[PDB]
């Protein structure tokens, strides 16, 4: 079994991939502290999402290959939806969360691809996209309930570590909150794509028509980097 126990007891090198373990070394104490927090939650008769083994999932793909950042706020509050990658759901989830449906609509309009068969964004993560939530856990059906609990330092470290590399980075920033992250990225070889959030509350205010995927690839090519294969089955 993998989860909060490993977060408290095991070194980062045993939790995340090698590049990420080095990049996140400054928040090694904080990850341990978050394990403690989750241990305290369970003791008090509360649950958290996603599964323990998925909390740090975004950092289980090669740090050296990350070329695009997509930031979310916190995990889906619907139990079974959050899988440790921002916006992603398990391949069996139907229908997908409305935010993801909106992302996929723009995906089809921008790229001309057919609608994906399922809501699993793992291929993006396997191809160099960091699907990072700012807060990595949440109490079921209680959005933002773990905000300010200590995850912010960890995910800030991830962002700043990425920016610290010489390599080009495209940051796709959806919503007002994600926009306030620009200062974290300013020291790097980075370009931001900014739009309203794909949430139904704000998607039709400018997310649709924003074409973030083709734009990200254009910017990467311009910066001399490999584009992302955005194609989903």
Swiss-Prot record:
The keyword Transcription does not apply. One of its GO terms (molecular function) is uracil DNA N-glycosylase activity. Coiled coil: none annotated. Keywords: Cytoplasm, DNA damage, DNA repair, Hydrolase. Its EC number is 3.2.2.27. It comes from the Bacteria. It is an enzyme of class 3 (hydrolase). It catalyses: Hydrolyzes single-stranded DNA or mismatched double-stranded DNA and polynucleotides, releasing free uracil. The active site is at residue 74. Gene3D superfamilies: Uracil-DNA glycosylase-like domain. Excises uracil residues from the DNA which can arise as a result of misincorporation of dUMP residues by DNA polymerase or due to deamination of cytosine. HAMAP family: UDG. PANTHER family: URACIL-DNA GLYCOSYLASE (PTHR11264:SF0). Belongs to the uracil-DNA glycosylase (UDG) superfamily. UNG family. This is Uracil-DNA glycosylase. The gene is ung.
